[PDB]
Structure 1
């Protein structure tokens, strides 16, 4: 069968992504406003978040919801959370760069149970439910079977909100460029995690990511053979926002390589 809450979540994400695509072909209807560093937030964010909240409350009028905009909407219950990003890579949707996704995951007792990301431009639908795995449009996902830091591709993100680490970050990337083959940068954390779980990139890492920008992808890469961690091998990545993810070999190699280049503030 199909996990129930997963079905509700994927239906909601489908509707949100259809609205996204609708707003895409109209470079007039987008009416954004700047909120952070070198990025806007659009009315489309509000519209999609509204659609998602409504579709969720239709079949779940009591579940807690979490979103970058609405913070934490505490439903009458507080054990079932829905971490939502109606857009990952709003910067790209501003410039209409066709690479973004909607992201929806469900936490039970603090543990992520189901998760979906949806790229409406390529109509890709990364689903993943705990104990059953991750699927791409009906194909299983095993992540890149690479066994070392050679020939690999490394997805990353530059900290446009915390540019202080940049220098350090730069060194890190520099060190990594000594061994790895090439990097990837799409400005979309969720899709980076998906591609990792998709075996399209053989490893991902980012300094200072938002909690609701990986809580869906992390279950994908988990149930797709990959593992996630902070930059020191611990599990505090959910608070620090410092993520590394990929198949165990490449993650171990990256951590061994970065143990020195890193800074004590991050560890």
Structure 2
């Protein structure tokens, strides 16, 4: 399980170097698609150096299939592109190594803050040399919830709003960064207790769900099942906050 993660972090580092080195140029969505494509190119071409047969799933061209269909590689060289558009330095590359339909390795890497969270079954979730723990919460008092708004699917918003409302009457505060993968990485390092999102897509949160799970946490769809892999209505965290949040959010189900 070492060499897979080895190639993973290699491609991650090269992609982050490219993204940052480019980010040092001025401007005031052409450029972001340009750099997204260039990062994907460097990523995949560095990949084909080893196992040019695993099936890559990007976020743009569906599933770039391969001849060794035992391993899928979920890729997003940029998440929450809005950030890189508007100069806000919060974005990370997300690589996920999945097998047989489930995921085994995951690496999220923020170039700006130079953070790098690795995760794999059993061997845990590390931050450049840290046995992560998740948060320590057991309730929804003095807690933080990394939220997310449907900036493409505003129809839920209303009931979503209701959730927010009720959540605000229960929790302590909210966050919003736009990089769902970074929200997941933050709940992995316990930087924020609970995470939830309405209608996400596997290419982004594939690595992040593996992160939060490996860090002693658990994920779920809005209705407690596991159709999140196809529905992306994520709710994740350590079981304590997950219960404390689901108990109050399920009663407003609309998906």
- Taking the TM superposition and a 5 Å limit, the aligned residue runs for 1:34-183 are 41-183=32-174
Measured after TM superposition, the shift of residue 78 of structure 1 is 1.3
**Aligned partners of 2:126 and 2:26: how far apart in 1?**
32
Measured after TM superposition, the shift of residue 39 of structure 1 is 11
Measured after TM superposition, the shift of residue 70 of structure 1 is 2.3
**Aligned partners of 2:29 and 2:160: how far apart in 1?**
18
Deviations 1:230-267 (A, max 9, x none): 11111111111100000101001111001212325xxx
Check conservation: 1:172, 1:262, Cα contact below 8 A. no
Measured after TM superposition, the shift of residue 79 of structure 1 is 1.8
- Residues 259 and 38 (structure 1 numbering): CA distance in 2 closer, same or farther, change over 3 Å? farther
Measured after TM superposition, the shift of residue 38 of structure 1 is 9.9
**Aligned partners of 2:24 and 2:112: how far apart in 1?**
11
Deviations 1:56-82 (A, max 9, x none): 111111110000122101111212000
**Aligned partners of 2:250 and 2:29: how far apart in 1?**
30
Q: 1:199 aligned to 2:198?
A: no
Measured after TM superposition, the shift of residue 5 of structure 1 is 0.2
Q: Secondary structure at 1:72's aligned position in 2? A: coil
Deviations 1:199-225 (A, max 9, x none): 000000000001111100111000101
Question: TM-score if structure 2 supplies the norm length?
Answer: 0.97
Q: Secondary structure at 1:160's aligned position in 2? A: coil
**Aligned partners of 2:56 and 2:69: how far apart in 1?**
9
Q: Which runs of 5+ in 2 are unaligned?
A: none
**Aligned partners of 1:27 and 1:99: how far apart in 2?**
17
**Aligned partners of 2:8 and 2:94: how far apart in 1?**
9
Measured after TM superposition, the shift of residue 41 of structure 1 is 4.5
CA RMSD, 1 decimal: 1.9
Which stretch shows the higher mean deviation, 253-262 or 198-207? 253-262
- Residues 255 and 230 (structure 1 numbering): CA distance in 2 closer, same or farther, change over 3 Å? same
Q: Secondary structure at 1:215's aligned position in 2? A: helix
Check conservation: 1:3, 1:129, Cα contact below 8 A. no
Check conservation: 1:101, 1:118, Cα contact below 8 A. yes
Q: Secondary structure at 1:125's aligned position in 2? A: strand
**Aligned partners of 1:112 and 1:209: how far apart in 2?**
17
Q: Secondary structure at 1:59's aligned position in 2? A: coil
- The structure whose residues are more often helix, as a share, is 2
Q: Secondary structure at 2:157's aligned position in 1? A: helix
Check conservation: 1:38, 1:160, Cα contact below 8 A. no
